[PDB]
Structure prediction request, 118 residues.
Amino acid sequence: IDAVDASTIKRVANRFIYDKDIAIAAMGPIQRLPDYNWFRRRTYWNRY
Amino acid sequence: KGFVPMKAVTYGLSPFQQKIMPGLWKDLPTKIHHKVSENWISATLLLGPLVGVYSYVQNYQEKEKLSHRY
Prediction:
């Protein structure tokens, strides 16, 4: 556990999170929840 | 202003799981026959009075040109 430092976090985050596909399931009054292209685009930051 | 209460179920895939381009040249003989057997009275109403008027003018001007010649 303590062999996981700040550099280990970024390397596993780039393997699993950064610019990857997602899966969504929603239920209820969900007409104001954003759509799939809104969510897929925000898996990366076009600013850094 | 913009609210209609609703009830439905939608499913959707990801963009990077499908074939983007090949659905254009798919059945172009079938696509062409659908457009011209359903829009052939709207082109007989657009080109019809123009082909028939151009035929009248070219016939009128070819009979007052041969009546002025000596």
Observations:
- Residues 6-16 of chain A form the longest helix (11 residues).
- The CA atoms of residues 13 and 26 of chain A lie 25 Å apart.
- The helical segments of chain A are 6-16, 36-41.
- Chain A touches chain B through five residues (CB under 8 Å).
